[PDB]
Design a protein around this ligand. Structure first.
Ligand code: BEF
Ligand SMILES: [Mg+2]
Length: 638
């Protein structure tokens, strides 16, 4: 059920009703009945726009073209009224397929938070709605559940996936606060081992969480609100046309009456001064504009799709050229989103091969996220893997222990070796590791009996794509750029140097990304490129939101106005380039479409009739359509 086929039927009826009676075997009784159908199908939808708004509202172009057809039938019947209602009906349908809007992603966001929470009541645990949690309530979050509230940990220890908010999908170890009365009074001093957020996914261990924000004030409830209370962003060419229509219709109706009464002052017959009014009426119908403006959009959109960029409508395709600034998420946007082994630092008499073989011997038994990366990359660097360790056990929150070659091996955080029986950590190795941490490596220290073997460093490296695409976009004039990541500052700065972005912010919350975007939007067009929930508010508030089409959260793909379906960043230079040509093509088509009307209004006030009207309108429409079709040939020049 769609009305676009009425335009098709107007075509079939207009063509066969026009051709058959004159270049075929058809009665004018029948070909006129086809012209009647070409008015019926043309009129039935185009009518309602005017009827509906003019019942209480203001005048609009849909009034002009709809009565123009009636005039064409009443006076000098040429059935060009059909050419008008056909071309007006396609003028609607082509706009119909151009539209898109930002607020739509609500359906996914709700799934991130549970409806209910277990809450302690002395010797009982009750079930309550999150709407009914008071501050200072102790909720119970058990294994693999969604956390219901922003709070701090007060009982138990676990590994929590904070991906919806930090953008990092690696579990973060959480531990209980040492005094909850102090923490509740001094939330600003909450270590990130203890703070937790709603919509995080719990790990193996149950946690008691003391609530600190109400249901409506959690960081995720803010993400929901900011995505919903974002606006639509107007196409400038559309709103220019809105202005023009509102003034143009009451402008041309002046000529409608002045020329209607022209016989009273000038030597002309009354019925032909009425034909003068109908001529300037039906000439005024901007059939060129009604086709030119959407056809550039639909063409460029389909070209983008064949180039691997999904575009949600005309507005972002127009905005993408005029950008002064662009901002990038790190994790999963500029980086792939997974740790790689990047640094190896032997110690004492340990060789590099010994450090890697003991590391892989133990990490073959772990199920922490880093372990698979250690095994992958040791097998790549050495070509082969050692025998697995014995006696594997976790040291919860700090690392692991195992046994290799009859010697006890500990691997983990610097805090583990301060906490366990063996030789204390050397003061120089401590500093070498701290320098790896400052340079943005997640670091493990490896110790074997008497001997520290050394340390290894892993980092989520940037896409090879990235530095090339950044410099490219600078050449196209995007001299305002920054990175805004929820990941910690050392990883952000290290990847910023690797990618070549000089301003880089980590440890951001989603609202902080909206703040950096607002500081850019004030001074130009800004685009936001991202892959996760914590980016969706910035995507909605920015001038144009762009999601990684494959790594993207469904929230981001719904919210964004652009999706890079390849996860190829080199689509961005193409996307802005096509946008610019798309703006040029319609810019030129706009002044053709106006001139054909604005220059031939007086040519019909000079007495030209309906016969020239249809021909000129046909020529204008054909030229605008063909010029728009240039965009299908646009080239990547990659
Ligand atoms: F995923 Be982004 F780096 F916050
Ligand atoms: Mg991300």
């Amino acid at each position: 059920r769609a009305e676009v086929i009425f335009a098709v039927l107007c075509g079939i009826c207009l063509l066969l009703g026009w051709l058959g009676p004159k270049y075929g075997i058809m009665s004018e009784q029948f070909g006129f009945g086809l012209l009647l159908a070409a008015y019926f199908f043309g009129g039935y939808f185009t009518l309602r726009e005017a009827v509906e708004k003019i019942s209480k509202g203001q005048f609009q172009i849909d009034f002009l073209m709809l009565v123009a057809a009636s005039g064409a039938a009443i006076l000098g019947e040429w059935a060009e009224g059909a050419f008008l209602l056909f071309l007006f009906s396609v003028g609607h349908a082509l706009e119909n397929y151009a539209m898109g809007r930002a607020r739509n992603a609500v359906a996914a966001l709700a799934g991130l938070t549970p409806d209910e929470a277990l809450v302690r009541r002395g010797d009982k645990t009750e079930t309550v709605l999150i709407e009914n949690l008071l501050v200072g309530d102790i909720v119970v979050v058990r294994s693999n559940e969604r956390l219901p509230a922003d709070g701090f940990v007060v009982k138990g220890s676990s590994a929590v996936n904070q991906a919806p908010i930090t953008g990092e999908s690696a579990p973060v170890d959480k531990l209980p606060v040492d005094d909850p009365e102090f923490a509740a009074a001094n939330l600003d001093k909450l270590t990130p081992q203890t703070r937790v957020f709603a919509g995080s996914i719990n790990g193996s261990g149950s946690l008691d969480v003391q609530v600190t924000k109400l249901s409506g004030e959690s960081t995720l409830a803010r993400v929901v609100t900011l995505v919903a209370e974002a606006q639509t962003r107007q196409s400038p060419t559309q709103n220019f046309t809105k202005k023009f229509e509102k003034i143009f219709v009451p402008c041309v109706i002046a000529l409608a009456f002045v020329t209607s009464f022209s016989f009273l002052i000038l030597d002309e017959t009354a019925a032909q001064s009425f034909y003068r009014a109908m001529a300037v009426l039906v000439a005024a119908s901007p059939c060129a504009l009604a086709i030119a403006t959407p056809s550039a959009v639909l063409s460029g959109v389909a070209r983008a799709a064949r180039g691997g960029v999904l575009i949600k409508g005309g507005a972002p395709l127009e905005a993408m050229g005029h950008l002064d600034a662009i901002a990038f998420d790190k994790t999963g946007t500029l980086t792939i989103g997974e740790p790689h082994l990047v640094e190896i630092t032997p110690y004492g008499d340990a060789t590099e091969t010994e450090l890697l073989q003991v590391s892989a011997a133990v990490e073959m038994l772990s199920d922490h996220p880093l372990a698979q990366a250690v095994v992958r990359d040791v097998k790549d660097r050495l070509g082969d893997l050692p025998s697995e360790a014995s006696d594997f056990a976790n040291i919860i929150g700090q690392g692991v222990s195992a046994k290799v070659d009859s010697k006890v091996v500990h691997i983990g955080k610097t805090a583990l070796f301060e906490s366990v029986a063996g030789l204390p950590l050397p003061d120089d190795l401590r500093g070498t590791v701290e320098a790896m941490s400052q340079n943005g490596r997640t670091t493990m220290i490896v110790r074997s009996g008497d001997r520290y073997l050394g340390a290894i460093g892993l980092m989520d490296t940037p896409r090879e794509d990235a530095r090339s695409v950044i410099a490219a976009l600078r050449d196209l004039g995007l001299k305002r750029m920054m990175m805004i990541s929820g990941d910690n500052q050392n990883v952000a700065n290290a990847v910023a140097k690797e990618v070549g972005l000089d301003t880089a912010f980590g440890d951001l919350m989603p609202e902080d990304k909206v703040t950096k975007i607002a500081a850019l939007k004030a001074d130009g067009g800004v685009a936001m490129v991202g892959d996760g929930v914590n980016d969706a508010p910035a995507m909605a508030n920015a001038t144009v939101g762009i999601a990684m089409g494959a790594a993207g959260s469904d929230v981001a793909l719904e919210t964004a106005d652009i999706a890079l379906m390849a996860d190829d960043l080199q689509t961005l230079p193409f996307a802005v380039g096509l946008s610019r040509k798309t703006s040029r093509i319609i810019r030129l088509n706009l002044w053709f479409s106006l001139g054909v009307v604005a220059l031939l209004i007086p040519a019909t006030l000079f007495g030209l009739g309906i016969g020239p009207a249809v021909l000129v309108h046909e020529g204008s429409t054909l030229v605008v359509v063909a010029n728009a079709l240039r965009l299908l040939a646009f080239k990547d020049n990659r």
